[PDB]
Structure formats: C-alpha cells, structure tokens
Amino acid sequence: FNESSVNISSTYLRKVLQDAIQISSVKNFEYVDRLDSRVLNPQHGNLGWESFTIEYKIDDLPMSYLFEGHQHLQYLKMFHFLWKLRQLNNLLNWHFEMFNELNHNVVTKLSSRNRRPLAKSLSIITSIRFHFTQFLNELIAYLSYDVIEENFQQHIVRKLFYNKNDQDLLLNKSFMNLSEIDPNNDLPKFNVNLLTIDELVELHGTYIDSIINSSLLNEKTNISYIDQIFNILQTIFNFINTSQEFYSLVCTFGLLVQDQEDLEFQLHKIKRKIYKDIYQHDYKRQLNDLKNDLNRDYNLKDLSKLL
Amino acid sequence: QSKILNTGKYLNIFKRCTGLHNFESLKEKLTTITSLAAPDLELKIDEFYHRANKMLMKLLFDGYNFPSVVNIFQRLFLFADSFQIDNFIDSTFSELKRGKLKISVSRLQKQYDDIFKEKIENKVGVRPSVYDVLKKNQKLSVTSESLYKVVEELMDEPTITSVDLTIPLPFPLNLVLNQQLSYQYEIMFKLLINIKFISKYNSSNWQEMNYSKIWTNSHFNSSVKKWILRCRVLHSRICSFIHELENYIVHDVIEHNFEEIKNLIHTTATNLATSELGSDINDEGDNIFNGSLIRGTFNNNSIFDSKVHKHRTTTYVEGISTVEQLIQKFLDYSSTLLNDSLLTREESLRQLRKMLDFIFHFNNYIVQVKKVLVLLNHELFNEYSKEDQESIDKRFANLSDTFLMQYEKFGENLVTFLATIKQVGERENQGLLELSNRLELCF
Amino acid sequence: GETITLQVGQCGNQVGLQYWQQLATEHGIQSDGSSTPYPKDINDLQLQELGKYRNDHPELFFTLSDSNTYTPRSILIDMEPSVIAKSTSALPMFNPRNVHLSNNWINGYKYGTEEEETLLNLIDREVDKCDNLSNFQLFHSVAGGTGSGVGSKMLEVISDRYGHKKLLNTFSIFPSVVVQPYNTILTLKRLIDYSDATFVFHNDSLNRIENIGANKLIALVSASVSNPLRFPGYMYSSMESIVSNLIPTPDLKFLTSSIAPFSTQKHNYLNEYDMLLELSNDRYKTNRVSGDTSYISMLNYLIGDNLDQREIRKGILKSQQRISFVPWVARSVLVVHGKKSPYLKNTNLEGIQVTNNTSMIDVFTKILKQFDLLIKENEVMEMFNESRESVKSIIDEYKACKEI
Amino acid sequence: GETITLQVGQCGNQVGLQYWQQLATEHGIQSDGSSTPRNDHPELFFTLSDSNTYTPRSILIDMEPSVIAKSTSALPMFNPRNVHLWINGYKYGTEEEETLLNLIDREVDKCDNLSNFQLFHSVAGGTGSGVGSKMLEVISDRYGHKKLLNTFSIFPSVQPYNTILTLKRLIDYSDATFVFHNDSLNRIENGANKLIALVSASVSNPLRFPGYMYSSMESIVSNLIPTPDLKFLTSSIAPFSTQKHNYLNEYDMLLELSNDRYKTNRVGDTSYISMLNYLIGDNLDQREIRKGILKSQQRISFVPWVARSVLVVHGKKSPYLKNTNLEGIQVTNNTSMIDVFTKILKQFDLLIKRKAYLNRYYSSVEEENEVMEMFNESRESVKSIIDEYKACKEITYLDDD
Amino acid sequence: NIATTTKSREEELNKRIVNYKIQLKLMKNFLQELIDR
Amino acid sequence: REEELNKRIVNYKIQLKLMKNFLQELIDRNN
C-alpha cells in the first residue's frame, strides 16, 4: 500500500488478500470464498491506503438484483471513512512498539550525561501518542456501538423478526364468525414478516441511509462535524510523520556513541515542534472547538463528555 | 437453441455408443410437449436436457471409465510416472541428440514401443483394462514442426526438439478429450521431453566430469587443475539451475493444478455411482389454454431475459453436473498449464529458448573438451596415442578464453532470464513470482 | 498475531495449568486435543415454521495440527518434576517435547546462564511454528526460588535474542523468609529493564478476595484479558492495542487488575449498569489500593450476550465522575464489549477491570523498606545497589506523575 | 537402472538384514519371496522369476558362517549361491579375487541395465573391513568408472590404524559415501541398525515408487557432489513420527529437519555444500512446501561458490503401509567432515608415534617398509581431503591467486 | 480509470487469444486435409 | 491498452467464423 495506486497489480492484491485470510480468523469463515479485494480509482496521486476496498460478492444470488448500486456505493463510502480511522488506530500501535523498543535498545544504554534529556523527550512523545490513541478509541467505540449496532438492531432485526404492529393489525376480526380458513393448512407460517420486493428494497435502503446520514456523519462555525474530525485526523498524520524524523535522529544519536551538539539541537527543535505546534497549538485547540460544538446537540452531549 | 441442439446430440451419442435403437429398456415415463404456445416449454426443455446429461454422464463415468482415462492421459503425456520415459531416453540417448535428418526415423518408433506398449495377453471373456486398450493406440513420430516453431504460431536442430506423441481415442471418449485439449497436452509433452533430455545430458556429463579417467587424472599441473575445478563448479551451477526449473514446472504447475481436477472427478464419480439411470418427468393437465397462448407478435418480457446475466457459476457443488462444464474444466486446465509455463509471452519464451540452447551447446562443448585434455597431460597421452611445450601452452591459452566466454555467457543469460521472470510474475502470473523469489534467493 | 505462553516455577505452573484448562473449556477443546463441533450462532437469526466452520480464533493460542488436534503454545520450565507430572496428567494435550526439567536467586540465575542454549533452542522451536508472532506471555512468581532466577534469565534471553521487536507481557505474582526480599528486588530490576507490561498480583489481596483457590482467580483474570483476541470484535483484537491504551510512557508500565467475584452466585449482578459501578470498588482489586490513589488509564471488560447499550452508556457516564483521574490525563473510561463463548452454558455476565493507577507507590515502598531492613563476591552487592537505584527510579517517577 | 547390494562383515550383514526386511515390507514381498496383492518397481532391487518369486540382488560376504546363517534363516528368500565365506584380511581377499570377481559378474550378467553398486560395511570391522576394501578395488578396476558406487560406511564410535587403512581406499574408489556414527545413532535413540536401514531405504524411494522427477540415482547423487573430492554425505532423520505429538505440518518437517541434534554424525558451526530433502506421505500440500523451502533457503548458511538451491523430492508412500502419517529424511553435504577426519588423524598420529601394536603387522624389514609407506600414503590422502574441505569453506576457492 | 481487481485481466484475455489460436490452426489443418482429396 | 487485445480477439472471432463457413460451403457443394 505504500506505493502509488497505479503500481499495485492484481497478483499482489491476491497475495495480500490470501495471506491476510490465512493469518486472521476468516479462514474458518463459512463464506470465505466470496471475499474479494479491489482498487477503485488507480490515480497517480492516490496511495494504496486511499484506494483499497474490500468487496463482498453476492452476485451469485438473485438478492443482488434487489440491492441497487446506490446502496453499494453508500456501503463503500462508509467503509472508506472507517478504513481511515482504523488505519490511524493501527499506525499508533506501530508507533508505540517502535518507540518502546528504541527505549530499551538505545536510550537506556546511552551515556548518563545526556540520558535524562532524551528520556524526558521520549516520555513526552509517548504520552502524546497515548492521548491520541485514547481519542481514536473513544471515537471508534461511539460509532461502532451507538450508530452501526443500534441502527442494525433497530432497522433490520426489529423490522424482519419482531412484529410490525400497525393500526390494521390492532383489529381482531374474530368477532366475525369466520369458521373457515384459506387457502389451506399447507401454507406455512414463517416466523418473519412477509415483505414485498419494493418493501425489501426500501428496508435495506433506509437501514443504510440511517447510518450514512447519522447526526455526526451528516453534511450539516458554519462547518460540519466530519470536517472537524478529518482535521484532527490530519493532525495525527502530521504527528506520525514528524515522529518518524525524531526516530531517525535519535537512532543517529545512539549510533554516534561536535556532531553531538548539532544532534542535540535538532532533537530539541523536533521536540519543540511536536509538543508546541502539533499538540498544543493544533490538537488541543481543535478538540476544544469540537467539544464546544458537540454540546449544542442533545444527542452528542454524552459523547462530548467522553470524547 | 443450444439446449435443444445439445440434448438431441447427447441422446444420439448415447444411442450410437450403447447400440440401443430406442430407450424402451429403461422403461421411463416421459411427457411430450403438448403445444408451441404452452407456458412450460422452457421447463420441458430444461428437464429433457437434464435427462440427456444424466444419461451421457453416467455412460462416460460408470460405463466408459473416464476417471481412469484421465489418469492414463496424465501418465502418458505429463509423465506422472517418469520411469518408462526415463528408460526410453536412456536407451536412445545417442540417437535423440543427433540432427533431425541424420538419423533413421523408423527406429525411434520401435524403440519406443518396446518400452511403452509391451503386452501380455488375457484369455477370452476376461475384460481388458482401459489402460490396456489405450496403450496400443499411442504412436510416437518425428515431425517437421519444431517446438520453438510450432509454439510461435500459437503465440539441423537435435531430434529431441521435434519428437511428438499422439494418442487417437475411442468414440465417444474423443468427444470430451477434444483435439484442442490433446494438442495442448502434446505441447506439454514436447516441453517436458526437452527438459528431461537436458537433465539426462546434465547427469551423464556429470558422471564423466567426475569419474572418467581423463578428468579424474591426478597428474595435471596446477593450472589445469584449477581450470578443471572451475569447470566442475560451473557445471554444478547449471545442474542446480535445471533441476530448479524442472521442479517448478512439474510440481508447482502440473501436479498442483491437477489436484483440483482429481478431487472434482472423484466427487463426480461417487455422485453418479449412487444415481439411477433414466428420470421420470410428470406434468399436470394444463388447462390454461387462452390464459397461456399469448398469441401475437410477442410479450414485453423479452427485455428481462437480456437484462439478467449468467456469468456467476462457481463452487463446483456436487461435482461436475453438465458435460459442457466437464469439457470446460479440462480446457481451463490445459490453458493454465500453457500460461504458467514460460511459453505464452514472447519475452519469457525467447529467454527460455536462449537458456536451453546455451545449456545444450555447453554440454556439447564439454564433450568435445575431453579430446583436448588428452594432449595437455603426458601420463595419459602416451597411452591414448598408442592407437611440444609451446603447443601445449597454446592449447591451454585457447581453453582459457573459450571457458571464460562460456562462463560470462552463462552469467548474462541468467541475469536476463531472472529479470524477465520478475517482470512477468509481477504483472500477470502469480506462480512465476514465487519462482522469481526462489531463483533470486539462489544466486 | 500469535501468542507464546511461558510458565516458570511451581506457582507459575500451577497457575498455567488452570489457565490452559480455562481456555480449553471456552473453546470446546477437550483434554485429549480433540475439537468439538461449533454450535450454531445465537444472533444469526433464521427463518422458521411455527463442520470445520468457526467464527472465533482459537488457533491464536493453540497449534492446529494436520489431524484436527489442538496443542497449546506453552513452554514449561522448572526443576521439580512433580508439578509438571500433575500438569501433564491433567492435560495430556501438552507437548512432551515442550517440557524442560533440571532457593538462592544467584544459583538459579547461574544455572539459567549455563544451560541457556537448550532453553533458547526450545524458544526458537516454538517460534518457528508461529507465523507473524505478536507477543510473549510469562507466568512466574517474583519470589519463591526457581521461578525468580529462571524467569529473570529467560526474560533477558528473550529480550535480547529477538531485538525487542515483539512486546513481552508478564503475569508476575508477588509474594505475600530472609531470602525473599532479595529475590523480589532482584527480579523486579529485570522486570523494569525488559518487561513491556506487568500485571501485578499480590497474594495477600488475592486471599482477601477469596475469603469473601488463589491461583484460580489469577487464571480467570489472565484468560479474560485476552477475550477480545480470541473472539474478535469491533475494537482491539490485538494484544499491542490493548496494552498501548494503558501505558502512556515506558516507565508507567505496571498495571493492576480488578475482578468481579460474583460470576456464579444466584445473587449475581442485575445488569451491566450495576456491574460497571461495582467494578470500581476497591475491595475487589488484586492490589491493595488506598483512598489517595489516582488513575492514569481505565479499561473495563464486559462478557455477555446482547448487552444493553443504554445501561453501558449510563454506567460509563456515572462512573466517569466518580473516578479520580490524574490531572494531565483526560477523563476517559473505556468498556470492552466482549463476546461470551457459545460453549459455556452459564449465561451470567463476567467482567474484569484492568487499571493503571498510582497505588504502586505504596507497594514498591513496602518492598524497598523490607529490602533496606534486610541489607543491614562483591559483584552481587553491586547488583543489589543497582536494583535499589532502579526501583527508586520509578518510585520517584510515579510520585512525579501527580504533577502537571 | 538396477542396483546391486554388497554386504561385508558382521555389522554390514546385520544392517543389510534390517534393510532388506524394511524393503520387503514396503513392497509387500513375503519372507519366502511370494508376492502379496503394479505401479511400484521392485525389479530394480529384486530379481523376478517366471514362477513369481522375488529374491534380493544382494551378495553376502563374511569371515564366519554364524552371521550369514542367521541372516539366511531369518530371510529364506536369499539365494545361497551368493553367499561367500586388517592386512591379513586384505591379503586373504587377494587370494579369493577370482571367485569374488566371477561371483559379482554373475549378478551383473543377471540384470538387464546396471546402474550402481551399493555397499554396506563397517570401517571399524577389522578383517571384514579389509575384505571390503579389496572389494572396492576389484570392482572399480574391472567395471571402470561408468558404474558408480555408493558405500553406507559405518564409522567407529589399534582401531585408528584400521580406520585409516580403510579410509584410504574409501576415498580413492567410492563415488558417494554416506557417513554414519554409532555415537549419534544411539544418541538419537535416547536397534541402532533400524535407523541406518530406514535412511538407506528412504534414500532410493524415488526410484522404487516413481513420480514426476528424480527417476534415477544419477539425478539424486549429482545434486550433492559438486566435486569428486567432496564425496562424504551427512544424513539427517526426523525421529518424531508415529507419536501423537508428531510434526503438525510438512513445513515444520522442513524447518525442524535441519536441527543439528538429529544428524547421524557428531558436529559446531558448519557450512552446507548441497541439500536434498525427502518428504514421504500419501498427500502433500504444495503451498506449505513452498513456504518451507523459502524459509530453509533464508536460514541455512551455504558456501559462497555453490548455487544455493534447496531441493525437495515429493516421495510417495507405499500402498502396503496403511495410512501412516508423514515422515521425512534429509541428506546433506556439510563441511563438518573436517572435525571427524581431524579426530581420526589425531588418534592415528598419537598411536603411530607410539609403536603400541604394530608388531602384529610388521613381520620383517620388508614388511616394515611396506607398512610404513602404505601408512604414509593413507595419512597423506586423508590430509589432502581435509585441506580440500577446508579450502571449500573460504571465499578464494575459485581464485588462482 | 478501470477498476483494478485481484484476478489478472490481461492474463484472461491472453489465454482467450491462445485458445483462439489453437482452434484456428486445428481448423486449418483439417481443411487442408479435406481440400487436397 | 487492453483495447488492442480485445480488437485482436474480435478479429480472430471473425476469422474462425469465416473458416467454419468455408467448411459448410465446401460440404454443400460436394453434396
């Protein structure tokens, strides 16, 4: 995924997908065959992370004709957003592992003279990473267990299996004698509401629409919540990219043991940039604005208190 | 249209094969098409087509023992049992390496039949095996179309480049083993015989290089000793490269793909074993009449037939159920064998042709070297001459440049071949990518 | 990823046996290694009139052989063979090849050094069966003899043989004799140096919980920590992701766990809302915690079928105010919606809480005071001094954690 | 092509008995030579009569009749016509040269297309080692070098003299010599002939149970002997099979076959010259083998001038063995031979400076000179092979500097 | 741009062309055998 | 780029159809 979207070929995608299927728990999944990966728009300016999409093939069934392409497009939009969030969540884990390993390999073995300043800078960096991880985890928890799960249980499970009580079902017609039954006892009663074709299409369309057009994900400071969230995500991306430079500088400090003063100055400069600009100047300001924005909404006040 | 035509053809094949004049013996209950305006015409056609497939499938599998014909084709064409072909190459090693026209063609036929189609007869009434029937059918003949020329169309040299094997088939078996499938099998036969022959040339040359008296002689001077050591190491590299290439082609391409077909055919055989012959079709009185005629030009439902698509068929559930899929599976298998092998692209084929030519010519050069080494050392020159310093120095100087040329040519060919495999594997073929990784990890 | 479990010492083996029996029970793997057919899913509703398929990840811990037989990724290291014999008899599925058999900490450390090649070969053999390894799990007692020295030497060996490229947990059990304080400090020095995340368990607090054996609680907590890994869900599903959420800096790596005892008594918790409040209680924590404590990170585990979202949301909101967070850490409480194993008939909820609080100041203070009292070739005394200074290096750090 | 087995000495005869019992079990041949209810080819190792009886091609040679009597009684299908009954033994072999030459020529005439000679003998066998050392000379002289020889020599656990005298001819005439040590065999067991028999039986599996590849002994050996000087092979066997806790996959067989503890000879750091791994199971998963080959290539230290290729043969299990789990054998060519040869040379020098037992060999002045020159030649040849194996390790092996 | 997919598009087209080159040449050989009589 | 392969595919479809029509013509005339 590091290389541009034009470089990735079909064979590499197939190798990646098969290896990931073997590693994970999907290899025992009943319909593991149906899974298939693809790249949507192989533009030069788009990297692999910005184009990869997982596609669940249901073309072999007549059900695919009920599900119009618009619904699938809204299923690939929401997947794209969630894919970005989880990409950042995992990048922070890799950051944690690499910095923790560097702590044992270099800093703790360094000379006692300059060990303390480097230890302090490393602790600052890791604490910033911890703050970002907490924020991302809270956002993912809110989406997963208040938007996707609630909408599923409310619009699919409760529409199909529980009774769709209506004003016509209220009337008990057995006040009429109605001794007869038709067409015959041979016709089953099926534990699920009998839905028309248009009813099935509308049911799945409403279920998808509720998720994609939720309170947080709508397009409605005259700015939408999505834009603020994406701005915070860009802040985290910048943090990761700068932390990689800090990684290279500190490992070059480890390798050295007149250059020491230059490297120490660069370390101070990088620490100042990350601590002041990215975190204090950008992240805390954006999060304060977002928290104040959320309190104006009754639904999102609870999320604001945590997130 | 296809269903009607194929149903009729399949019933005709059954009647002509088993000899029945009509299907009275099966005593099955059948329903005929009452009218052209009936609503169940498509259902009736589908049922008839399924009946025809059921009968022809059971004929082929249970009666004609097709599953064993698949293993027989595997053995004879792709050397799933390489003992016999190894004996054949060993017996005619001197002939096969000679130019096409410089050797008698009729001898190869006989020297092949003594190896392959040998026989012991069985008493009257004892059933012949299908292998017994197909052994005597096969014929190996030399053809004018060389491998590198015949494969270029579907984009003297030593006789090995032009020896082919053909197997005519009984009716109806030849309908499933269509000529296009047998031709794709023949191409693989020619490729594998080339590689097997070169491996047999790499082993014999390895036997002389190590243990023949001239090469193993201890009384050479230091320079000739180091020259011999360099030559032995280079030949070891060539041997390892050829064994790696053969391993990929035979285990990573042929056997790996064949496992799927073997499993599918076993499943189909088990499915048909428990299935009766002949199916009963019933129907109601069909009182619809005017409610079904729909006379006129046509209905507006024709659009739905074109709107739907039937390109989604997979999972090979319950084995192969239609003879068309039975043929399609083997056609796909043969296409996979040709595509995976380095014969489909132009870059891969050209690099393979250069590599094989270079190895063969190197073996011939090794053979001609044996004569030169006699003159260099004295202790054995006197023995061989029974039947000057400047000249000896000239001979060694000539061998220096010749051997260096071969060494550098090998390096060039190897580099180009690896680059070509890497690009093709990254672009199209998954199987070639792992071969590229293995060969790169080798050198 | 894959997880390799290492058990050192008599206490470690006793805990690990029940830990593996717990996991085998949850995944339906019998003691002989035979697998049980997976029951149909409960929330996968189906239309109604009125074998190898699975949706869990047991192979993350057990090696699935070609003959459909599971085998734990465990390595048993000790000297007394009686405990190993009992463990193997209880669980024949343990691989005999994986067993290694042979008071002063120095003697055990030197024994581990001399025979390091064999143990290292065993570790490499276990790793070779793992593709894309994730982390190591260690079950050992800080004090007690064989466990201290052997586990410390294995800690160093594993840390430096793989370049620290995989995180390494530690399910250390702290002691509740003249040699014990020395062993505790000496082992804690290497715990500081090498371990990536330490679960502190105190035997006295475990006895306090029990009377309301002691190894069963440790096994339950350890086998419930990795519930998201074996039953993947929306969040986490990776051991590095769980640990990274509770360790802000490499120094503040010591975690402690709280356990809800009443998983079976018929007066069990009414709902998720009640259990969320009860988990914060200080009487069921596995480490003695005072009222001056402050929490650096919060993580709550919930294990049940179709948990009510309203109750969880309200419980998180109420519990957020009660908890005293460290000034420089944002108020954040996280709840893990784990999935109960379908093989378990018990329908009652279970919930384990894992915390990173500042109560470690008092515990390490007690250890340090006992060591100082007991102190009152020369190389060993230098190591004692180094351990004293290393422990103080995080004593003062946890104290400074209070300050912005 | 067909192969001829030669058994020399008591240890050789016992190992041969186990080997032929294993081979007959694999091909379902009964003790009396009758068949049991073909795709396999026992003809390469058994002579088939037109009365449906299988008899081994082996030739039994021993100084005493007790061992041969036990071997023949245990396996009645041996042909009695093939039974025949250090310096003293070698001189005795000179006297019986005509009879043995005709005896071997009978077997060669009986087969259709000879391929190679197998030899089962013990280097430390005393007199029997002498007669086997003469056997190698006579065979190599009469049949030239078109037919190669394979010797499954058993190394030793006055003996140094015998080991050096036998190793001189073993180096000179053998074409591919396996090395087995009783020390490593009994270490693995922690009887011993059942390991050697199993390894030797599996080494030829691709010949008796044909597949796609490796249909001849030339192909099997040529992959392991780049130079005729480096002719000693180290064999490794995976013992963990047929137990409940056996290897979970063929990939783990490939990874754990390389452990130094399973090798059949004492080994520190070693460099591999060539590799070839045997996998023998009814069904083999290709993708596991590909992954294992890649890991094995990335993990093993090859010498600089070798192509660095690892070859895995997909052997087929015998129908007569019921559904047994996977098993595998590894045959390698290492530079570890220098250690054992150095040990032998050190013992020989230590016991040659001290005239301990040379009175049993030096009979007169001419005998003293004869034994001295013979011993010097043997010592020089062993040093030459040690120096060659040592020069293989370095990177300037191909340089003329 | 056309969507990328795990299955090799160019491989499928190339295999189709090769299978169309076998049918053509076999048909030509048969027609040659038919015409010359 | 793959347009070119599709173009060649259709060209060979036409050529195969022409060959089959040639066979039918020849057989019809011989009868």
Numbering used by the authors:
A (entry chain D): 462 to 681, 687 to 723, 736 to 785
B (entry chain J): 375 to 529, 573 to 804, 814 to 869
C (entry chain B): 3 to 52, 70 to 121, 129 to 202, 209 to 244, 262 to 425, 440 to 467
D (entry chain I): 3 to 39, 73 to 120, 131 to 202, 211 to 243, 262 to 338, 340 to 473
E (entry chain K): 231 to 267
F (entry chain L): 239 to 269
Which of the paper's sentences describe this entry?
The γ-tubulin ring complex (γ-TuRC) is a structural template for controlled nucleation of microtubules from α/β-tubulin heterodimers. For ascomycete yeasts, MT nucleation occurs mainly from oligomers of the compositionally much simpler γ-tubulin small complex (γ-TuSC). Whereas the CM1 motif of CDK5RAP2 binds to pre-assembled γ-TuRCs in vertebrates, the CM1-containing receptor proteins Spc110 and Spc72 promote oligomerisation of yeast γ-TuSC on the nuclear and cytoplasmic side of the SPB, respectively.
Here, we determine the cryo-EM structure of the Candida albicans cytoplasmic nucleation unit at 3.6 Å resolution, revealing how the γ-TuRC is assembled and conformationally primed for microtubule nucleation by the dimerised Spc72 CM1 motif. As the MT nucleation unit comprises higher oligomers of structurally identical γ-TuSCs, two complementary data processing strategies were pursued: in the first branch, all γ-TuSC units were treated as individual asymmetric units, resolving the structure of the γ-TuSC unit within higher oligomers to 3.6 Å, which was sufficient to build and refine a full atomic model of γ-TuSC components. While the N-terminal parts of GRIP1 domains are structurally unaffected by oligomerisation (residues 91-308: Cα RMSD 1.86 Å (Spc97), residues 150-306: Cα RMSD 1.42 Å (Spc98)), the C-terminal parts undergo a hinge-like rigid-body rotation that guides the GRIP2 domains and the associated γ-tubulins into a MT-compatible conformation, in which the γ-tubulin molecules are in much closer proximity as compared to the isolated γ-TuSC. This conformational change is accompanied by remodelling of an ascomycete yeast-specific extended interface between the GRIP2 domains and the formation of an additional interface between the γ-tubulin molecules on both spokes, primarily electrostatic in nature. Our high-resolution cryo-EM reconstruction of the γ-TuSC unit within higher oligomers displayed density to the amino acid side chain level for two α-helices forming a coiled-coil on the outer surface of the Spc97 GRIP2 domain. For both α-helices, ModelAngelo predicted a sequence highly similar to the CM1 motif of Spc72, revealing that the CM1 motif of Spc72 binds as a parallel dimeric coiled coil, comparable to human CDK5RAP221, but, surprisingly, different from monomeric CM1 binding in budding yeast Spc110 10.
